[PDB]
Design a protein around this ligand. Structure first.
Ligand code: 9EF
Lengths: 303, 79
């Protein structure tokens, strides 16, 4: 009676010690690494070992390999036949590969190119702008904080809707310490301040630079199964729409509740989250709606 | 100075601590697997169990650094 969706998560802070041993021993990762290393002309696992930060270009490519491999590992070891798939933020990249909208080689090229593109853009543009995540923040409490920012003439945008009380707000870091104390003052808990920021109408120039330098050269195919857009849950069926999703990521917010309502409307009852993740598989938006399988490196490392 | 009620509650959110390992006063909670959404669930369970509302300084990172600091913080609110 059920149906299964394959979901691809956003990228959390890389931790090479979390996945380096997994990547070189699991046959699903080893197979994609051979392809990623041939496309890139280096050893991705070696470059990722030496990378500093949590969001290096190498950790973004490795994150693509880990999610796409763990989707195939779950299909082959759990007899999954998904009718539909969806990707949140980075996971748009992973779902483009899984769905057949891009060859794995073009997804690796795209992931590396967008990494370099964003690095360059944020080296000079929107200096000090950050994306804050917070929880226990009902929309009514958030709206009062946004009105206080408006009163002071402080620019912001809502970048993600995660759950009824879980949002990401993008604004200048000069507002960071006030926002954190102001959240806490009403029982909301700040989680993380992401640099570079993501998902803002103000980032049209990053969209344009991505399109010209990375995305337009690529050939997009029609996906082999429907793809739910993370912007608004629209059911996508063509390569042009997947390409638009990747570009709209820069300038439209993630609406995670809309992915979950769309999946529900397409008859989904069970989701597989493919890859390392401690948000999309565990957040109430997802678990209230669906049985969750969490296909993480930690699970695939179990005896 | 904590008790079984508190420790049974906390240990539900510390996946990398085995039931036969002691819960040290100053163990780093993040290192034995307390994370952001584990903290949200923990908070929700502490608030229902003890009839308290964590707010202001009780929601800083420092509150969840160790079972010692978390116990002190919960204690100041239950009395
Ligand atoms: C998809 C999107 O736009 N997400 C917001 C921007 N990305 C991030 O903030 C990445 C870091 N995310 C994480 O650290 C986790 O997702 C949490 C839940 C924000 C915090 O986890 P924690 O265990 O401290």
């Amino acid at each position: 009676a059920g149906a299964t969706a394959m979901l691809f998560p956003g990228m959390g802070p890389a931790a090479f010690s979390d996945v380096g041993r997994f990547m070189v021993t699991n046959r699903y990762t080893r197979e994609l690494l051979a392809e990623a290393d041939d496309t890139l002309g280096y050893s991705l696992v070696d470059r990722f070992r030496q990378a500093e930060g949590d969001y290096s270009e190498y950790a973004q490519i490795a994150f693509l390999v880990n999610c796409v491999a763990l989707a195939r590992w779950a299909e082959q070891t759990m007899d999954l036949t998904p009718r539909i798939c969806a990707g949140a933020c980075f996971g748009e990249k992973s779902v483009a590969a899984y769905s057949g909208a891009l060859t794995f080689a073009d997804a690796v090229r795209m992931t590396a190119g967008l990494a370099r593109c964003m690095d360059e853009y944020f080296r000079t543009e929107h200096l000090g702008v950050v994306t804050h995540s917070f929880v226990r923040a009902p929309r009514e409490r958030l709206d009062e904080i946004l009105a206080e920012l408006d009163e002071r003439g402080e620019w912001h945008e809502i970048s993600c809707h995660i759950d009824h009380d879980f949002f990401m707000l993008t604004l200048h870091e000069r507002n960071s310490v006030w926002l954190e104390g102001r959240l806490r003052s009403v029982g909301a808990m700040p989680l993380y301040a992401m640099r570079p920021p993501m998902h803002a109408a103000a980032f049209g120039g990053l969209r344009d630079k991505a399109e010209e330098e990375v995305i337009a050269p690529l050939t997009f195919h029609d996906p082999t199964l429907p793809v739910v857009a993370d912007q608004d849950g629209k059911v996508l069926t063509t390569g042009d729409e997947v390409r638009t999703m990747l570009l709209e990521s820069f300038v439209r917010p993630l609406r995670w509740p809309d992915v979950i309502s769309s999946l529900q409307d397409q008859g989904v009852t069970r989701v597989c989250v493919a890859g390392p993740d401690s948000l999309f598989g565990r957040v109430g938006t997802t678990t209230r709606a669906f049985e969750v399988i969490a296909a993480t490196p930690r699970l695939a490392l179990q005896p | 100075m904590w008790d079984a009620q508190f420790e049974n509650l906390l240990r539900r959110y510390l996946p990398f601590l085995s039931a036969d390992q002691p819960l040290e006063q100053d163990i780093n909670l993040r290192d034995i697997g307390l994370d952001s959404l584990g903290t949200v669930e923990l908070l929700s369970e502490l608030e229902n169990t003890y009839d308290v509302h964590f707010q202001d300084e009780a929601l800083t990172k420092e509150t969840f650094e160790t079972p010692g600091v978390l116990w002190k913080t919960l204690s100041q609110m239950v009395e």
